[PDB]
Amino acid sequence: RSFVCEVCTRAFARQEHLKRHYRSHTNEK
Ligand SMILES: [Zn+2]
């Protein structure tokens, strides 16, 4: 019911967190 990093399947209260979180998963900005 809340964004979830399909990568580490991490859920956050904010989207930015996810996005920014991904930054690590890769390097796409
Ligand atoms: Zn993740």
Side-chain angles (χ1 to χ4, degrees), residues 5 7-8 21 25:
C5 191
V7 170
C8 67
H21 158 79
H25 284 331

